[PDB]
Scaffold this active site. Sequence first.
Site, PDB file in Angstrom:
ATOM      1  N   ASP A 178      -6.014  49.597  22.036  1.00  0.00           N
ATOM      2  CA  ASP A 178      -6.289  51.023  21.900  1.00  0.00           C
ATOM      3  C   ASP A 178      -5.906  51.525  20.513  1.00  0.00           C
ATOM      4  N   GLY A 179      -4.843  50.962  19.932  1.00  0.00           N
ATOM      5  CA  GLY A 179      -4.516  51.265  18.547  1.00  0.00           C
ATOM      6  C   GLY A 179      -5.671  50.972  17.615  1.00  0.00           C
ATOM      7  N   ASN A 188      -6.274  61.117  21.344  1.00  0.00           N
ATOM      8  CA  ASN A 188      -5.226  61.055  22.370  1.00  0.00           C
ATOM      9  C   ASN A 188      -4.440  62.363  22.425  1.00  0.00           C
ATOM     10  N   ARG A 238      12.998  75.252  22.913  1.00  0.00           N
ATOM     11  CA  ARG A 238      14.079  74.497  22.293  1.00  0.00           C
ATOM     12  C   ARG A 238      14.143  73.139  22.969  1.00  0.00           C
ATOM     13  N   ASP A 245      13.156  68.625  22.152  1.00  0.00           N
ATOM     14  CA  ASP A 245      12.804  67.545  21.235  1.00  0.00           C
ATOM     15  C   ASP A 245      11.452  67.774  20.574  1.00  0.00           C
ATOM     16  N   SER A 262      -8.726  62.431  27.790  1.00  0.00           N
ATOM     17  CA  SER A 262      -8.541  60.981  27.767  1.00  0.00           C
ATOM     18  C   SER A 262      -7.168  60.587  27.239  1.00  0.00           C
ATOM     19  N   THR A 313      -3.609  59.915  29.970  1.00  0.00           N
ATOM     20  CA  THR A 313      -3.019  58.667  30.444  1.00  0.00           C
ATOM     21  C   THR A 313      -2.125  57.992  29.412  1.00  0.00           C
ATOM     22  N   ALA A 314      -1.916  58.596  28.250  1.00  0.00           N
ATOM     23  CA  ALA A 314      -1.149  57.981  27.179  1.00  0.00           C
ATOM     24  C   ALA A 314       0.224  58.673  27.094  1.00  0.00           C
ATOM     25  N   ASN A 329       1.132  61.748  27.041  1.00  0.00           N
ATOM     26  CA  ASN A 329       1.186  62.823  28.022  1.00  0.00           C
ATOM     27  C   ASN A 329       1.677  62.337  29.379  1.00  0.00           C
TER      28      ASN A 329
HETATM   29  N1  LIG Z   1      21.872  67.201  18.327  1.00  0.00           N
HETATM   30  C1  LIG Z   1      20.726  68.121  18.231  1.00  0.00           C
HETATM   31  C2  LIG Z   1      21.125  69.580  18.369  1.00  0.00           C
HETATM   32  C3  LIG Z   1      20.293  70.364  19.376  1.00  0.00           C
HETATM   33  N2  LIG Z   1      21.024  70.622  20.609  1.00  0.00           N
HETATM   34  C4  LIG Z   1      21.416  71.867  20.962  1.00  0.00           C
HETATM   35  O1  LIG Z   1      20.966  72.879  20.426  1.00  0.00           O
HETATM   36  N3  LIG Z   1      22.382  71.922  21.903  1.00  0.00           N
HETATM   37  C5  LIG Z   1      23.233  73.097  22.046  1.00  0.00           C
HETATM   38  C6  LIG Z   1      23.179  73.749  23.413  1.00  0.00           C
HETATM   39  O2  LIG Z   1      23.619  72.776  24.390  1.00  0.00           O
HETATM   40  C7  LIG Z   1      24.845  73.214  24.965  1.00  0.00           C
HETATM   41  N4  LIG Z   1      25.730  72.079  25.332  1.00  0.00           N
HETATM   42  C8  LIG Z   1      26.483  71.141  24.518  1.00  0.00           C
HETATM   43  C9  LIG Z   1      26.080  70.924  23.192  1.00  0.00           C
HETATM   44  C10 LIG Z   1      26.149  71.019  22.003  1.00  0.00           C
HETATM   45  C11 LIG Z   1      26.069  71.026  20.532  1.00  0.00           C
HETATM   46  N5  LIG Z   1      24.899  70.329  20.001  1.00  0.00           N
HETATM   47  C12 LIG Z   1      24.487  70.861  18.701  1.00  0.00           C
HETATM   48  C13 LIG Z   1      25.335  70.582  17.480  1.00  0.00           C
HETATM   49  O3  LIG Z   1      26.503  70.043  17.709  1.00  0.00           O
HETATM   50  O4  LIG Z   1      24.943  70.854  16.366  1.00  0.00           O
HETATM   51  C14 LIG Z   1      24.895  68.864  20.130  1.00  0.00           C
HETATM   52  C15 LIG Z   1      24.407  68.405  21.492  1.00  0.00           C
HETATM   53  O5  LIG Z   1      23.088  68.922  21.746  1.00  0.00           O
HETATM   54  C16 LIG Z   1      22.592  68.247  22.888  1.00  0.00           C
HETATM   55  N6  LIG Z   1      21.142  68.145  22.791  1.00  0.00           N
HETATM   56  C17 LIG Z   1      20.408  67.590  21.772  1.00  0.00           C
HETATM   57  N7  LIG Z   1      19.118  67.575  21.993  1.00  0.00           N
HETATM   58  C18 LIG Z   1      18.986  68.159  23.241  1.00  0.00           C
HETATM   59  C19 LIG Z   1      17.872  68.409  24.065  1.00  0.00           C
HETATM   60  N8  LIG Z   1      16.614  68.095  23.732  1.00  0.00           N
HETATM   61  N9  LIG Z   1      18.094  68.984  25.266  1.00  0.00           N
HETATM   62  C20 LIG Z   1      19.347  69.291  25.611  1.00  0.00           C
HETATM   63  N10 LIG Z   1      20.474  69.104  24.924  1.00  0.00           N
HETATM   64  C21 LIG Z   1      20.226  68.524  23.743  1.00  0.00           C
HETATM   65  C22 LIG Z   1      23.305  66.886  22.964  1.00  0.00           C
HETATM   66  O6  LIG Z   1      24.029  66.780  24.184  1.00  0.00           O
HETATM   67  C23 LIG Z   1      24.262  66.915  21.763  1.00  0.00           C
HETATM   68  O7  LIG Z   1      25.504  66.307  22.109  1.00  0.00           O
HETATM   69  N11 LIG Z   1      27.223  70.279  25.246  1.00  0.00           N
HETATM   70  C24 LIG Z   1      26.971  70.655  26.598  1.00  0.00           C
HETATM   71  C25 LIG Z   1      27.442  70.184  27.840  1.00  0.00           C
HETATM   72  N12 LIG Z   1      28.308  69.172  27.964  1.00  0.00           N
HETATM   73  N13 LIG Z   1      27.010  70.784  28.970  1.00  0.00           N
HETATM   74  C26 LIG Z   1      26.153  71.801  28.868  1.00  0.00           C
HETATM   75  N14 LIG Z   1      25.632  72.344  27.767  1.00  0.00           N
HETATM   76  C27 LIG Z   1      26.051  71.762  26.641  1.00  0.00           C
HETATM   77  C28 LIG Z   1      25.421  74.243  23.990  1.00  0.00           C
HETATM   78  O8  LIG Z   1      26.345  75.101  24.648  1.00  0.00           O
HETATM   79  C29 LIG Z   1      24.122  74.938  23.592  1.00  0.00           C
HETATM   80  O9  LIG Z   1      23.670  75.789  24.640  1.00  0.00           O
HETATM   81  N1  LIG Z   2       2.647  56.207  18.118  1.00  0.00           N
HETATM   82  C1  LIG Z   2       3.759  55.339  18.541  1.00  0.00           C
HETATM   83  C2  LIG Z   2       3.294  53.983  19.043  1.00  0.00           C
HETATM   84  C3  LIG Z   2       3.884  53.578  20.388  1.00  0.00           C
HETATM   85  N2  LIG Z   2       2.915  53.692  21.469  1.00  0.00           N
HETATM   86  C4  LIG Z   2       2.421  52.606  22.106  1.00  0.00           C
HETATM   87  O1  LIG Z   2       2.936  51.492  22.011  1.00  0.00           O
HETATM   88  N3  LIG Z   2       1.286  52.814  22.806  1.00  0.00           N
HETATM   89  C5  LIG Z   2       0.387  51.716  23.134  1.00  0.00           C
HETATM   90  C6  LIG Z   2       0.148  51.522  24.619  1.00  0.00           C
HETATM   91  O2  LIG Z   2      -0.446  52.735  25.138  1.00  0.00           O
HETATM   92  C7  LIG Z   2      -1.775  52.459  25.565  1.00  0.00           C
HETATM   93  N4  LIG Z   2      -2.679  53.622  25.378  1.00  0.00           N
HETATM   94  C8  LIG Z   2      -3.225  54.237  24.181  1.00  0.00           C
HETATM   95  C9  LIG Z   2      -2.560  54.044  22.961  1.00  0.00           C
HETATM   96  C10 LIG Z   2      -2.395  53.583  21.871  1.00  0.00           C
HETATM   97  C11 LIG Z   2      -2.024  53.123  20.522  1.00  0.00           C
HETATM   98  N5  LIG Z   2      -0.750  53.657  20.044  1.00  0.00           N
HETATM   99  C12 LIG Z   2      -0.106  52.762  19.082  1.00  0.00           C
HETATM  100  C13 LIG Z   2      -0.686  52.621  17.692  1.00  0.00           C
HETATM  101  O3  LIG Z   2      -1.858  53.167  17.506  1.00  0.00           O
HETATM  102  O4  LIG Z   2      -0.090  52.029  16.819  1.00  0.00           O
HETATM  103  C14 LIG Z   2      -0.726  55.090  19.710  1.00  0.00           C
HETATM  104  C15 LIG Z   2      -0.504  55.964  20.931  1.00  0.00           C
HETATM  105  O5  LIG Z   2       0.722  55.594  21.589  1.00  0.00           O
HETATM  106  C16 LIG Z   2       1.002  56.605  22.539  1.00  0.00           C
HETATM  107  N6  LIG Z   2       2.446  56.718  22.705  1.00  0.00           N
HETATM  108  C17 LIG Z   2       3.384  56.953  21.732  1.00  0.00           C
HETATM  109  N7  LIG Z   2       4.605  57.077  22.189  1.00  0.00           N
HETATM  110  C18 LIG Z   2       4.468  56.914  23.556  1.00  0.00           C
HETATM  111  C19 LIG Z   2       5.388  56.968  24.621  1.00  0.00           C
HETATM  112  N8  LIG Z   2       6.695  57.203  24.463  1.00  0.00           N
HETATM  113  N9  LIG Z   2       4.914  56.787  25.872  1.00  0.00           N
HETATM  114  C20 LIG Z   2       3.608  56.562  26.040  1.00  0.00           C
HETATM  115  N10 LIG Z   2       2.646  56.490  25.118  1.00  0.00           N
HETATM  116  C21 LIG Z   2       3.141  56.683  23.890  1.00  0.00           C
HETATM  117  C22 LIG Z   2       0.332  57.899  22.047  1.00  0.00           C
HETATM  118  O6  LIG Z   2      -0.615  58.355  23.004  1.00  0.00           O
HETATM  119  C23 LIG Z   2      -0.368  57.469  20.749  1.00  0.00           C
HETATM  120  O7  LIG Z   2      -1.633  58.114  20.635  1.00  0.00           O
HETATM  121  N11 LIG Z   2      -4.067  55.259  24.443  1.00  0.00           N
HETATM  122  C24 LIG Z   2      -4.100  55.329  25.867  1.00  0.00           C
HETATM  123  C25 LIG Z   2      -4.793  56.146  26.782  1.00  0.00           C
HETATM  124  N12 LIG Z   2      -5.634  57.119  26.412  1.00  0.00           N
HETATM  125  N13 LIG Z   2      -4.614  55.941  28.105  1.00  0.00           N
HETATM  126  C26 LIG Z   2      -3.786  54.971  28.496  1.00  0.00           C
HETATM  127  N14 LIG Z   2      -3.075  54.130  27.744  1.00  0.00           N
HETATM  128  C27 LIG Z   2      -3.243  54.320  26.433  1.00  0.00           C
HETATM  129  C28 LIG Z   2      -2.179  51.160  24.863  1.00  0.00           C
HETATM  130  O8  LIG Z   2      -3.242  50.519  25.559  1.00  0.00           O
HETATM  131  C29 LIG Z   2      -0.849  50.418  24.967  1.00  0.00           C
HETATM  132  O9  LIG Z   2      -0.642  49.949  26.295  1.00  0.00           O
END
Ligand SMILES: NCCCNC(=O)NC[C@H]1O[C@@H](n2c(C#CCN(CC(=O)O)C[C@H]3O[C@@H](n4cnc5c(N)ncnc54)[C@H](O)[C@@H]3O)nc3c(N)ncnc32)[C@H](O)[C@@H]1O
Ligand SMILES: NCCCNC(=O)NC[C@H]1O[C@@H](n2c(C#CCN(CC(=O)O)C[C@H]3O[C@@H](n4cnc5c(N)ncnc54)[C@H](O)[C@@H]3O)nc3c(N)ncnc32)[C@H](O)[C@@H]1O
Lengths: 261, 261, 261, 261
Positions: free
Chosen positions: B45-46, B119, B145, B147, B155, B158-159, B161
């Site tokens: 697919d790549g 994709n 807020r 990642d 299409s 299935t990737a 998403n």
């Molecule tokens: N490293 C990327 C920075 C982005 N993350 C962010 O804004 N987190 C802050 C928020 O989370 C609360 N928090 C903490 C925290 C903190 C401080 N944080 C920022 C800093 O230090 O700069 C670092 C932590 O971030 C968390 N984090 C990162 N990415 C995600 C994500 N995608 N989803 C959820 N959490 C994420 C990780 O676990 C890191 O350890 N510990 C707890 C806990 N024990 N229980 C409940 N709430 C908690 C905090 O009050 C606030 O409401």
């Molecule tokens: N960009 C980071 C590279 C890591 N991703 C990877 O190894 N994907 C390959 C696998 O996915 C299948 N695939 C494709 C694909 C492909 C080629 N791929 C590699 C390249 O081009 O170098 C790029 C795509 O990767 C997918 N991808 C990225 N990260 C994740 C993840 N965390 N989880 C699931 N998918 C992910 C995204 O949607 C990109 O578009 N399209 C479909 C489809 N329509 N339906 C069902 N299977 C499908 C393909 O057969 C193989 O089994």
Amino acid sequence: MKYMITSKGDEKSDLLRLNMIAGFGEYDMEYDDVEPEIVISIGGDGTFLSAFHQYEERLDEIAFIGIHTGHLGFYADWRPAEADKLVKLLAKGEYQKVSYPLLKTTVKYGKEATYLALNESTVKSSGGPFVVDVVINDIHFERFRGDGLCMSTPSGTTAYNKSLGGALMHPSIEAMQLTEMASINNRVYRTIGSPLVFPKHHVVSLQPVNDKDFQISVDHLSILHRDVQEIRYEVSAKKIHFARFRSFPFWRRVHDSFIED
Amino acid sequence: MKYMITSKGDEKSDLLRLNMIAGFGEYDMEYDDVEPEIVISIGGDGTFLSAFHQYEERLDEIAFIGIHTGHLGFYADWRPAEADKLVKLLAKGEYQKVSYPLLKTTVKYGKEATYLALNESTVKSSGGPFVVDVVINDIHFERFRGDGLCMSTPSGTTAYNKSLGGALMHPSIEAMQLTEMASINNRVYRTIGSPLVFPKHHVVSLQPVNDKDFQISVDHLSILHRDVQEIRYEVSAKKIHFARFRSFPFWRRVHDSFIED
Amino acid sequence: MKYMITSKGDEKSDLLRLNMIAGFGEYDMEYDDVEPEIVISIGGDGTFLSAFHQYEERLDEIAFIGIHTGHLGFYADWRPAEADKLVKLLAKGEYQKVSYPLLKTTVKYGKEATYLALNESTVKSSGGPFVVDVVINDIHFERFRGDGLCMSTPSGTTAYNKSLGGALMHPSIEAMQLTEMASINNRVYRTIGSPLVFPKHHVVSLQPVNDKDFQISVDHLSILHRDVQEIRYEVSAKKIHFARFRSFPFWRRVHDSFIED
Amino acid sequence: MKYMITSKGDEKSDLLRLNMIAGFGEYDMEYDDVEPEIVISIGGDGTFLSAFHQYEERLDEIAFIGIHTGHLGFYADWRPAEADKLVKLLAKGEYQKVSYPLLKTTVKYGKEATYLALNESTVKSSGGPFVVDVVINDIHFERFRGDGLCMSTPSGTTAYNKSLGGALMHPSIEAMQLTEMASINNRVYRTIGSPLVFPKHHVVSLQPVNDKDFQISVDHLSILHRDVQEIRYEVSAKKIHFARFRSFPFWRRVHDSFIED
Ligand SMILES: NCCCNC(=O)NC[C@H]1O[C@@H](n2c(C#CCN(CC(=O)O)C[C@H]3O[C@@H](n4cnc5c(N)ncnc54)[C@H](O)[C@@H]3O)nc3c(N)ncnc32)[C@H](O)[C@@H]1O
Ligand SMILES: NCCCNC(=O)NC[C@H]1O[C@@H](n2c(C#CCN(CC(=O)O)C[C@H]3O[C@@H](n4cnc5c(N)ncnc54)[C@H](O)[C@@H]3O)nc3c(N)ncnc32)[C@H](O)[C@@H]1O
Ligand SMILES: NCCCNC(=O)NC[C@H]1O[C@@H](n2c(C#CCN(CC(=O)O)C[C@H]3O[C@@H](n4cnc5c(N)ncnc54)[C@H](O)[C@@H]3O)nc3c(N)ncnc32)[C@H](O)[C@@H]1O
Ligand SMILES: NCCCNC(=O)NC[C@H]1O[C@@H](n2c(C#CCN(CC(=O)O)C[C@H]3O[C@@H](n4cnc5c(N)ncnc54)[C@H](O)[C@@H]3O)nc3c(N)ncnc32)[C@H](O)[C@@H]1O
């Protein structure tokens, strides 16, 4: 125009309905609950769901309007305080009608029964273990083992479907969405896991494997069906029509119901 | 007809391409990699994704065909053993063309750049914390807020998403689907959680809140963009066309890729 | 006792710290930021996380206290208005100390580096595709393909772990929890999907398959490591100690942070 | 030693049990199904579950052994082909016993009933809408609206709990895990969403809000209880003991059941 008003039946809703009837009396509007052209629902989404099913044989000749008296109402467009303005605008007419898709469920026995759903139709087992083969456009797709399956309209995607991990779909998309309820997945048993979104004219059939007794829900109605040979889901050709007097977009409605308001 | 063949570049794919070229030489077929009407992709697919982006300016004049040399190939319809039958059927023509929707990404600065995705298109932060306001048809829907976000074609569902919990959507549905990557939800921070499915003509805009630097992916291509004012998603008006020589339905393709084969 | 106070560095937190220092001056308390027995953190959880890592070599001789100046603070027990009562109770002593488990991360090269995490340690790829073999107590458990993995302490389970679908674990459980970030699952690639909860003395090793470069995070710190041979997770023998002056149970803290307050 | 053998009841399992009895006759082993010290289960996990509940009053004096005659058997350690070696090793004794935690469910009325679960205990509504207040150690944590709740032992985490998104927990952790079944979450209704993991001595109480009738399951047994005032979950003080004759680690058992074998 011909109109009728259903009420949730508490004091607030009954008195609101009486005041709207009194207000409607000041216009060329005839109260008629046999052949209404406008059906107003005063209550919750449960109340609106019951209004839809009360008139599901005349969906083509009816525009629906929901007034929510609680804090909710996804199918509601109006708070109780706007009811006088609603009477007046509805009397003057010139509203715009919008249509949402519906889901057709067909249940076959060894005899056929069809149902129409505004939110969803679900299938569970009658106490025993739920196992069905899932057949899409006559292609065997999977054997589902687990608690049940949920097939949702677009406007149903914010209801049971949402709690099952399903996607929220804009109602302009003529589709239905199938979600799993607690599927068993190990090295011998495999389901797709993901929700599935089907277009119009695609047919999803559920076919029994051992037990043939199932609990089938259609919106709020839940019936035990016996001797089931097949449950068939498709996007209906019928549509529910809403009277719209102002812009309240679907995604703002979603925002207000789930993010903040 | 004018045609060209891209290869993954390992021994198996290169020799398969050479044998098809040799086979094509026995028909009125001209190898032309500048203006082909048929683009064959030999690999994964790549490889198919790279073939699409190599010719994304001529999508309207090209039908694509995928041959998978590994065990995979969602965009592939053919195993290496059927390649001679593919040459012959493609030479005789009379194939049917099918079209899948594509996603348009527009990136604005303080200058504009558009990209086409088969994709998905994803957005993450440039190291710091990712916070964007999500605006649907000019309505502020949520402040995300977490990642990142992923917007998928049908299409593409299935990737990436799929791995994010999104729904699988039949490609006849002209839509795009937005999924969350690890959203923060507490009593102060709220996102919808659920995947969102948008129809054609709906515009999803992502607008920065603090940092204006983002990593934006389009299929396999990932670029760091600086001074971003807005990222705009809509269903493209352009479509990818596949040459189809036999029935291989989307839901069987899903079954074969994820359930059993 | 010896004490020190870290501040987030905005006006509110700096002036709160100055007033507590002034208040501490009225007791047998010596400000010492080299060998404190009490470490107070004024700010958010990020601020508390930085206070922990500033003194991670003296965890056995320190009790931590968090004051949240924003609306958050999972590691905070005190609002800014209670600061005078905190000074007084801390001066009189007689507090109870509670301990939460920590996570040890060991990173080996071809050279060894260990890190201590209060929230979690995560692993992603250095731009390319992330593929690692997951080895539990020397048993090959799975080959993970996807975005990354997150290993969480019990008190980290409400942080990143929660957003990844992980379970919330009471901190009296000496365990660590592994969650997946967007795993690829099809008929050829299989991961467990579910979060995994490991007891003390269980060792989770991540071993590279192709690329050996990874982005490794420990709480807020994110470092690119090159030539990695193994990433090793275990419950640490070290523990973080909190000074507790009143009952604020973990599940009420969870309720206040996520349900209502 | 005193022993007994339960069989699934098909031809394969009945003849396997008869051959083991014949084999046991060649040693100082007395068949006794009233007070056995060894309970062998020949069949599936359902069969092993029924063997546990047949002897749940003598858990302290019994070591269990599972033989799986199908392709499954999480509580099974032996295939039918190893049965002769099992007889011989069991006769010579010198096995090691391992213990897994169990879950205590207490149901109160307006009268008390306790149950012991090896996999889990679940609660659903008796047809109507399921709404319960969730009280942890006498602290009101949430009001749950949805399909039901599931409380799992550690060895139950790979069963129903897994299908509900719960974490898999090593059985050396004395804990129980609560998972939601299709919770309603909008701006008025809020649950935690995440699975919750509770240590020993923590008490989770479910208290009715309107309806007081619930369907309560304990492993395979499902009973409708009326006039329920409270459902109380805690880690039991009782443990199930397994006779172990070789290393088959929990995480390899998980790998074999869900990844590959
Ligand atoms: N490293 C990327 C920075 C982005 N993350 C962010 O804004 N987190 C802050 C928020 O989370 C609360 N928090 C903490 C925290 C903190 C401080 N944080 C920022 C800093 O230090 O700069 C670092 C932590 O971030 C968390 N984090 C990162 N990415 C995600 C994500 N995608 N989803 C959820 N959490 C994420 C990780 O676990 C890191 O350890 N510990 C707890 C806990 N024990 N229980 C409940 N709430 C908690 C905090 O009050 C606030 O409401
Ligand atoms: N960009 C980071 C590279 C890591 N991703 C990877 O190894 N994907 C390959 C696998 O996915 C299948 N695939 C494709 C694909 C492909 C080629 N791929 C590699 C390249 O081009 O170098 C790029 C795509 O990767 C997918 N991808 C990225 N990260 C994740 C993840 N965390 N989880 C699931 N998918 C992910 C995204 O949607 C990109 O578009 N399209 C479909 C489809 N329509 N339906 C069902 N299977 C499908 C393909 O057969 C193989 O089994
Ligand atoms: N049948 C068992 C009854 C328990 N269900 C329940 O208390 N639902 C009411 C709540 O959902 C809202 N709602 C409705 C509704 C309604 C009325 N309802 C009650 C009645 O009619 O008696 C029947 C529907 O219930 C839903 N349901 C059932 N079980 C669950 C569950 N586990 N999780 C989530 N939803 C569930 C199904 O989709 C039924 O169709 N439609 C929408 C919508 N389109 N968008 C957003 N919110 C919506 C409504 O405002 C209120 O906030
Ligand atoms: N009560 C409704 C009956 C439908 N359930 C069903 O067919 N389950 C059997 C399958 O699960 C495996 N299993 C068992 C089991 C068993 C026997 N089972 C049948 C009987 O006794 O009649 C009762 C249990 O069922 C589970 N269950 C119920 N509903 C679901 C669902 N929706 N999703 C997943 N599991 C479910 C609950 O945890 C019950 O306790 N324990 C474990 C374990 N510890 N680890 C890994 N696999 C395990 C077993 O090998 C087989 O592959």
